[PDB]
Write a protein that binds this ligand. Sequence first.
Ligand SMILES: CCCCCCCCO[C@@H]1O[C@H](CO)[C@@H](O)[C@H](O)[C@H]1O
Lengths: 149, 48
Amino acid sequence: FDYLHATAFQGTALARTVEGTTENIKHLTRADLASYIDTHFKAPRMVLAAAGGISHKELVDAARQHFSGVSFTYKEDAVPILPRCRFTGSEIRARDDALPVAHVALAVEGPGWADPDNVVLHVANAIIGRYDRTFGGGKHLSSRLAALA
Amino acid sequence: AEPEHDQRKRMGLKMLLISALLTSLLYYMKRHKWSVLKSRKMAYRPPK
Ligand SMILES: CCCCCCCCO[C@@H]1O[C@H](CO)[C@@H](O)[C@H](O)[C@H]1O
């Protein structure tokens, strides 16, 4: 799945692993870390969510107390508009025959969180569904791909 | 000796035009399909 992103969104920010390079982990500084936190962990880009036996008003009160001072400039208010990521009809094949079983991922470009088509794509994905050799349903599973599998 | 003289060369014209067109088109389609291999890069990355 890392390789999938690395080639699907090749040449963009989405092509990077969440954990990062070995060199980066090696050489990241306290300044670099503190910079990330100050640059990204900012109030408008954060959501304090809660769920349980919690009074909402009591929640926003304790939140009002510990989630702190107002930003001064307009820069610190505005939420950044990320540069777009380019999809690439491409492949990456990392071959290792000593590896017991092979893994294959194939994907096309999606619509994004906003698009209402994401609902239909989930309905479609539900049709094909999923399987692993412990699915007790076996040959009688409704999913055609699972039945053929 | 060859009454087909006129039609033969008339065909030769049609042939050469068609052949020129088709050879070019098929060359693109070949290059298009082979573009996957022609541009392909590979690396050797062991757990060295
Ligand atoms: C790849 C090769 C394609 C060759 C196409 C040749 C088509 C020839 O076509 C011929 O041309 C003659 C001259 O007008 C006509 O008399 C014939 O009726 C016609 O069939």
